[PDB]
Amino acid sequence: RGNLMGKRVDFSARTVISGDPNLELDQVGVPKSIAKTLTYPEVVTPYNIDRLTQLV
Amino acid sequence: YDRKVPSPTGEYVKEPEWVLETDGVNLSEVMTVPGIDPTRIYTNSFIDIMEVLGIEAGRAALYKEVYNVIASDGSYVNYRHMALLVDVMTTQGGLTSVTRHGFNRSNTGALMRCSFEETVEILFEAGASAELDDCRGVSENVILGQMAPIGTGAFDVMIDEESLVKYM
Amino acid sequence: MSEEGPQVKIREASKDNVDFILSNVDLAMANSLRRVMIAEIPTLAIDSVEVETNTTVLADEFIAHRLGLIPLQSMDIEQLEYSRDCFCEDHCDKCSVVLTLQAFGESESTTNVYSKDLVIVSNLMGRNIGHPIIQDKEGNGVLICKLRKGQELKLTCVAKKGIAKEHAKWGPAAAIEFEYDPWNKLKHTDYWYEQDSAKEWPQSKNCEYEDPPNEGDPFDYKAQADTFYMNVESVGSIPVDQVVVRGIDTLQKKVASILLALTQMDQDKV
Amino acid sequence: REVALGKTVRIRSAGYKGQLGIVKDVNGDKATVELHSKNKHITIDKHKLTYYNREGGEGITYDELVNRRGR
Amino acid sequence: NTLFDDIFQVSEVDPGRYNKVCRIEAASTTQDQCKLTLDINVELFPVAAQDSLTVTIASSLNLEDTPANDSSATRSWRPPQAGDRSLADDYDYVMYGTAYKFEEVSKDLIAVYYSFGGLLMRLEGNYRNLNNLKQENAYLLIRR
Amino acid sequence: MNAPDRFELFLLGEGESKLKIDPDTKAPNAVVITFEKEDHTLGNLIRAELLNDRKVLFAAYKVEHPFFARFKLRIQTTEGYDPKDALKNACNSIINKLGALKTNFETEWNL
Amino acid sequence: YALATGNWGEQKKAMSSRAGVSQVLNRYTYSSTLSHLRRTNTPIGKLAKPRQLHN
Amino acid sequence: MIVPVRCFSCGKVVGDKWESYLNLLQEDELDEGTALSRLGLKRYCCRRMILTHVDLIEKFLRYNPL
Amino acid sequence: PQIGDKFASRHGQKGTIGITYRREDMPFTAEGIVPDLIINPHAIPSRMTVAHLIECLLSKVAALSGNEGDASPFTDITVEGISKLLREHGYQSRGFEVMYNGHTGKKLMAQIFFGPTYYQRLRHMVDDKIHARARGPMQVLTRQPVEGRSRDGGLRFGEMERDCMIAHGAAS
Amino acid sequence: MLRSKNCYLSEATESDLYKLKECPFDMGGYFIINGSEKVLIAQERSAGNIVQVFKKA
Amino acid sequence: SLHKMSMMAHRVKVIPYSTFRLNLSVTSPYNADFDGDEMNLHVPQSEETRAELSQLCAVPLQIVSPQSNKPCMGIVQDTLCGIRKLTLRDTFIELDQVLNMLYWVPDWDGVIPTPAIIKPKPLWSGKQILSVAIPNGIHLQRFDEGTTLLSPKDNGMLIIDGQIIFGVVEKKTVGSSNGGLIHVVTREKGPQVCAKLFGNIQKVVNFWLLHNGFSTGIGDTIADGPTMREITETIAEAKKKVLDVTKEAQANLLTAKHGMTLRESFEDNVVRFLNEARDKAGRLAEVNLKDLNNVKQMVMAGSKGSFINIAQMSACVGQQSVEGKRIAFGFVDRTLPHFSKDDYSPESKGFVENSYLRGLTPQEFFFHAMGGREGLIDTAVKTAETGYIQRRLVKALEDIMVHYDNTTRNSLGNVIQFIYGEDGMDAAHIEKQSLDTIGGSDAAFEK
Amino acid sequence: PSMILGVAASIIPFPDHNQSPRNTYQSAMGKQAMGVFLTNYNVRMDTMANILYYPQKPLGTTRAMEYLKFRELPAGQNAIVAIACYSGYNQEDSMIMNQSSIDRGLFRSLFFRSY
Amino acid sequence: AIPKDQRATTPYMTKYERARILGTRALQISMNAPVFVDLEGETDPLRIAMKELAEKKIPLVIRRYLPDGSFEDWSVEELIVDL
Amino acid sequence: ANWPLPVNIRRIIQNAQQTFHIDHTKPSDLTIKDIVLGVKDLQENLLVLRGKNEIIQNAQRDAVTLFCCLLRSRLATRRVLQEYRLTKQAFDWVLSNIEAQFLRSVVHPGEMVGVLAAQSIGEPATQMTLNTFHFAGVASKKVTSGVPRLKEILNVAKNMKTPSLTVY
Ligand SMILES: [Mg+2]
Ligand SMILES: [Zn+2]
Ligand SMILES: [Zn+2]
């Protein structure tokens, strides 16, 4: 009940929420620090080789 | 009380009637009292409803009780959810309480059962016996870290050679 | 009397406030002028503080903030170049003013430190900038900190050009009164009368100055706001008339820069 | 073995002119410099910022390659 | 492009919980069956009880030289110029709206409902005799 | 700390242009101009002056987000009239009005 | 030990002794300190009567 | 601790008004409102800056320094 | 102070900073007074915080007159006396003021309540609550992510989130 | 306990408290053990030697 | 996380500040505010999870809640009051503001609608801009009490081809109502269209309200002299009736209702009289309030407040009750030491005849404090009890599946329902409808 | 009659005009207010110490807190508050605070940590 | 146990099946699997998967498992997509 | 008469009247035979089970009785020819739209209905206010309702606080 059906996970963040009337219905304002910390693994493909090289 | 008795001309009208309210539960003998209507007698206690009526009548009484419970806050709940709940509670021949002595004492997998109540007792029972866990539930797959056969996992995806050579 | 443009009429003038009436001008222009006057005038203020000895009971950040909030003379501010646009390492005589403050506790009683104790050690080259503004009968100026016997304060400050948009310490104006249409002739607002509008809502002081009281005439839908009553108050770094002149100049410079950018992009396109 | 490591420096040009900080990490031509008054870290070219002494004195450019010392 | 014309003497003006919009009921002085119930803005058109207000329903504001056409719908209305001319110059109150109801009352009386952006007007008359050329998207011009 | 620098709202960064014009396909003879580092101060004045013109059929501006100091201005003019010409005329009129106002204020303060 | 851990009793049998008798002084605000210095607690452990404000 | 240099709301400089305010309070026996009016603080935004100020610097100065 | 810092009044009206504006963008009265804080009126009717408005009016009167205002309970002070004093000062019976938009300078309808009000800063700041983990330190026994912001911990995917995801049907 | 009969600050004046680097606004009433300030929370208990009658289930 | 709406998939937008920013319309399903709330964010690590989150847990995909068969998201807070004030009959907008509002709304076709009034001065009605925001092809028709095709109270609703004809938009149209505009848009067009409509409406209403302004003040809870006199007269009449009832009961001349003793009937009569008096005073205070009152304006919009709030804030506070009864005799036959023994008057038993604006006496202050403490304790117990109940319920039905044979079975394969919901229909795709055959008369049915 | 309140409840102005839960919330949250906790700071070494730059006495004082030394050691500031729906950025419980006031030294504070 | 003429399952394509197919196609494209349709310059695997599903060019077979254990195979191109 | 049903016929007919502009004056094109045959075909085209044997056919037939009754009520010949005046193309469009909406409103297999029901029942439980008292009508019987009543129903308590009985 504390380590099988519920466990701590990676690639997660938590910070104080706030309102923004200028945002869309499906949109969340992520702080720059959180974006720079959290990462997503992308497989290099001919369609994104230049973008991935620029990011690297 | 007022009852919406249909009018002889066709419309629906409010016909006042006398209703007796009792503070005791003895419907076994009250139904035999002459001068009353035995086909309309209702009791807020569903436990003894199936003592004199059927299991289906008990399920209907339980559903009515739940609907009356969710009636004052103004929230509206779809009939399907409450119907499913009362059908689960009355799947067997009697009331199945939502507790460790009710739906728990079933034939489901030990791993999925032991994740809510005390665990080591049922684990010891499983060890003493030799029952087989089919691992077709959600709790077993969560424990084993596999894709549970629910939602997107209810089917299997395969690749076909005929369609593969069809396109190109 | 210059062309059919905006007209001015000064009611009251002083060393810290100017009262004038704006006529033959649109609301947007007046609002833009007020915004520029409150958040666009370049001034001079302390930006960097170097602390050598601080034995007082106040924190270093406290004293730095208090020094940065102290107004300074900015009459000849157009002769000082921005630090970012200056070809120097940190600060030179043509882009900054250096001030040093030294305080020690000699007497047994508390020894106050005032803005008049600041001493300019840089070379002003004849420019009228950097002098602290002391608007007080006693001449002491803004009180910085209080230290007793034994305590010693010694630090060096650097003053740099800036605008109120970057930080509020560079603002030359304190509060600007803006009002138009003392009577509700344009119906731009709806009053909150409980029993009567006239009795519950006090009359503004600008009602007597022109704007004759309305009558039971039909509402005029072809009228627009053209007369504005404004009162500009200055902190002391810049005179009020100079504040208004510099606000107008800044607005003109911004519009001219927009026009220049448009012309440059048109030339680049062709 | 970079010389620009743990030395008090002053940032010139850009928007951080006149600021005081200490170099922390060097990544090729870019180096990470902290700030004294501001609680933030910024990355700029190592050839741009000047170099001062730890105790305090005159400041020099990136010519510290020929003199592996402070000041 | 004119579709209606009458005198419509007005009576019983009472807005109701409002300060800028009034509801005026009028009856034509020529026909004994015509009736009107229209909402107007008294800030620009301050009418009073027992008054004559010539009304006119037009499909378009163009002059008689240009015949009625369906190309005037969704034309991205432009601010009026100085040299342009229109039928509105002869009136004091012109409103634009859409018809949304055509009800039948009694045997020969029909009611036409219009909505001028929120202001509703109800017009009655003899079917196939007076209100036989009203479809939708019609102007309303009122003269003092 | 994620707090942006205070100078980022009024200083043009590297690789950024003050003006950037994009044609509008929604309506003919319509363009969209994006300004940088401006916060309503030039936007209101420019919109009012453009609306003061007679050959301009549309003039509006908006600020997408208070975080970034940038507003978009959309101008639609009549047939045969360049929106850039209308913008230049509005700017020239603003300059003339500001100069006249400054001269009048100086004359009034002199006495 | 009693004044530090807050368990009123000897070192042994601390499980059966009361806890929270001694607490670190709250010095975030003068009002907070004054409130903490005039605080009472009733050891009870489901029941609404003891929590109600009696007359 | 010490009087703020500038008013928070508008930005009027009140750093030299504390000594004059105390002197007017303790020589001329004027009430707070009259002293505030004499000092030139018209808007209540500036009035609240020195009307509700606590001089905690003296308490800190009471302790013996180094 | 920055966006996200918790602030509250003396009447249980807590909140956090959502946006910040400069002096030019803030609304202003005819005398050039801009507010330090702006509070949504929707919080008043639900919470029945009449004392907030009463204290605002009393503080405005005290600032205008210079004398300390008595807000002790069970006293003879009523709203009518404060209103009379404010009207004598010549501002408004109920404290309403006429402001302007500021962005355009146009007059604003629905006159705004104005006046000083005591506010306090709470110990909860957004700087001490923001956390983010991506493959940080590792535990020993359970070999699951550690717990705690100070030691670079990871948020727990509890059981409730598990049944929520189950109901969503997102098995992967 | 601080500011008690056995404490040095019981008879100290404002000047003495300032000299001893102690805040005159401090009220005492707490124990200083291991350099940490501890306050004993009052414990609420039923009064003894009192006859009480209750009805059982 | 109680319901599935507590988990949503959003689109990342990088912002220059260290906080989480979300649309105001998604707070209702989250049940969250901005007073210091904390919320967690999880990112996927594979294409499988990313695609399934985008196609299954997207925010627009959960507009209609399957629980209550109604949309779980709508216009709330000041946007509701702004949309109510904008759609008023007397609301008119000038040319420049109309152009600004039109440009603010995205996906705009660039066509300026014809103003309602053209001759004296070009003026656009408030409903025109909202109709521009609303996409075409949507038709809605709601009839309220006393609503006709020429309704003078501007009640009800009627939209034709995405154009507002009449009716002030309120919480019954852009709220969480089953027959509201949001439900119709979601059922007719795609969820993306509904999200775009949400954004456009929010933007236009916020822009209009920014330059208009909305406030509240102390005077909004102040009634005139005659209204307070009438309230005091009603309270005095209720007190006189209570005193007469007490005098009748003390003389043993009051009959006891069957099934209860004299004390219970007397207490029921007293509480009924007090509640009726409070309701009457509140109704009088609400009636006296003008249309320009800010609290009343918020009440009409439905964003916040209620009739009871106005009553307790302006006219009179209700009788304080603990455990469903009046204030019990904590002392020996007394409630407080300041009262005499055997005092059954409403003031001594916890009736607050004052109001929040007027102030409270110490006795009613103590009674109100006791009531608030009881309420806080009740919520504190109830949250834990309902949490445990929810956990047990989730555990009970955590393995119920609808299979490809349209039967609902558990993990063991036992059949509990041969067809889901006895009809095999999704909950989110059901709307309330009227059957015309059952109702009416035989003659009407035949005709 | 006002003597029946506690230390935290004695700071609330006009507590009789508010609902009881509001008074309870204010009393609970008063202990978390930031201010000058003691004049003995700068000589003590505490784990955490938050003090205010410019503490200010409340304008709406109460007679009960005269003996509580609240005026000598306040825990807040007098800020001008406008109750309005401006820009729609202060919905629910959010608030809009002036940036110029922040730059001029409003509500800023000091933080002390000891190891 | 793979009947064809006795397939009683719905001919339509469920939301879960659509999500799974789109995800699998996107993942395969991301890991450099051959694409049977032109991309129109697109570079996002998920949108390429949606484009392939639009014209029914995904070579996949859905195996729907009956509760007893039997199953029937449905081709992607033969499943009607309406949601 | 107001009951929740899958497909909204009124919205469909209103949309079909708004499109395919109805003159309201010209005679209609529908015939009695065409209307009756179209209604019967639409009734036969509603599939929710898709079986072949008699049992599944009967289940499909009696699982859509309410929807068939509503469709018959809303698509009567007199109603179409008098109020909902449409043309042949409009009628065909209405039938096709109704069939498509009904087929799209079927529950997708693989959905967790038990968890949905549990959440839909538990959410109002948390959202309810205090439910310990105030549940009294004419007679102050202190009838148990709300959270305690729901808890005792779920636990199936053999001794409820306030047993009741109703006699007609
Ligand atoms: Mg909250
Ligand atoms: Zn230089
Ligand atoms: Zn000021």
Short mmCIF file of N, CA, C and O and ligand atoms in Angstrom, two decimals, chain C residues 174-175, chain H residues 6-14 41 43-49, chain I residues 32-33, chain L residues 80, ligand 3:
data_model
loop_
_atom_site.label_atom_id
_atom_site.label_comp_id
_atom_site.label_asym_id
_atom_site.label_seq_id
_atom_site.Cartn_x
_atom_site.Cartn_y
_atom_site.Cartn_z
N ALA C 174 6.18 62.66 -8.45
CA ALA C 174 5.60 61.97 -7.30
C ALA C 174 4.17 61.53 -7.58
O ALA C 174 3.86 60.33 -7.53
N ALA C 175 3.29 62.48 -7.88
CA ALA C 175 1.90 62.17 -8.18
C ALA C 175 1.37 63.22 -9.14
O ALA C 175 1.62 64.42 -8.96
N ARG H 6 10.91 57.32 0.69
CA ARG H 6 9.87 57.78 -0.21
C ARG H 6 8.54 57.12 0.13
O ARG H 6 8.51 56.01 0.67
N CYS H 7 7.45 57.81 -0.19
CA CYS H 7 6.12 57.25 -0.01
C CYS H 7 5.91 56.07 -0.95
O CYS H 7 6.26 56.12 -2.13
N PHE H 8 5.34 54.99 -0.41
CA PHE H 8 5.18 53.76 -1.18
C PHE H 8 4.24 53.95 -2.37
O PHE H 8 4.51 53.45 -3.46
N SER H 9 3.14 54.68 -2.16
CA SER H 9 2.10 54.74 -3.19
C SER H 9 2.51 55.63 -4.35
O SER H 9 2.62 55.18 -5.49
N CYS H 10 2.75 56.92 -4.08
CA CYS H 10 3.04 57.87 -5.15
C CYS H 10 4.54 58.01 -5.40
O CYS H 10 4.99 57.86 -6.53
N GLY H 11 5.31 58.31 -4.36
CA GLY H 11 6.74 58.44 -4.51
C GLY H 11 7.29 59.74 -3.97
O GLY H 11 8.44 60.10 -4.24
N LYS H 12 6.47 60.46 -3.20
CA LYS H 12 6.93 61.70 -2.58
C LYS H 12 8.03 61.41 -1.57
O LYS H 12 7.94 60.46 -0.78
N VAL H 13 9.07 62.23 -1.59
CA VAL H 13 10.22 62.03 -0.72
C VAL H 13 9.90 62.58 0.66
O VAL H 13 9.69 63.79 0.83
N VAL H 14 9.85 61.70 1.66
CA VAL H 14 9.68 62.09 3.06
C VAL H 14 10.81 61.43 3.84
O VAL H 14 10.66 60.33 4.38
N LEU H 41 2.07 67.33 3.67
CA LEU H 41 1.53 66.04 3.24
C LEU H 41 0.02 66.17 3.10
O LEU H 41 -0.71 66.18 4.09
N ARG H 43 -2.12 64.33 0.46
CA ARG H 43 -2.75 63.04 0.22
C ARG H 43 -2.54 62.12 1.42
O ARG H 43 -1.50 62.15 2.07
N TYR H 44 -3.55 61.30 1.71
CA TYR H 44 -3.46 60.39 2.85
C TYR H 44 -2.43 59.29 2.61
O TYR H 44 -1.97 58.67 3.58
N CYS H 45 -2.05 59.03 1.36
CA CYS H 45 -1.00 58.06 1.08
C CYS H 45 0.31 58.47 1.73
O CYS H 45 1.01 57.65 2.32
N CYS H 46 0.66 59.76 1.62
CA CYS H 46 1.85 60.26 2.30
C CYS H 46 1.62 60.42 3.80
O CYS H 46 2.56 60.26 4.58
N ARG H 47 0.39 60.75 4.21
CA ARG H 47 0.11 60.94 5.63
C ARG H 47 0.31 59.65 6.41
O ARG H 47 0.89 59.66 7.50
N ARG H 48 -0.15 58.52 5.86
CA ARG H 48 -0.01 57.25 6.55
C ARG H 48 1.44 56.80 6.66
O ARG H 48 1.76 55.98 7.53
N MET H 49 2.32 57.32 5.80
CA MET H 49 3.72 56.89 5.83
C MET H 49 4.40 57.27 7.14
O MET H 49 5.14 56.47 7.72
N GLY I 32 -4.43 61.64 -8.34
CA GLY I 32 -3.20 60.96 -8.68
C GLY I 32 -2.77 59.89 -7.71
O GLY I 32 -1.58 59.58 -7.64
N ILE I 33 -3.70 59.31 -6.96
CA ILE I 33 -3.39 58.27 -5.98
C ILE I 33 -3.66 56.91 -6.62
O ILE I 33 -4.76 56.66 -7.12
N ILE L 80 -2.72 50.74 0.59
CA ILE L 80 -3.95 51.21 -0.03
C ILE L 80 -4.53 50.10 -0.89
O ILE L 80 -3.86 49.56 -1.78
ZN ZN O 3 2.32 59.59 -1.25
#
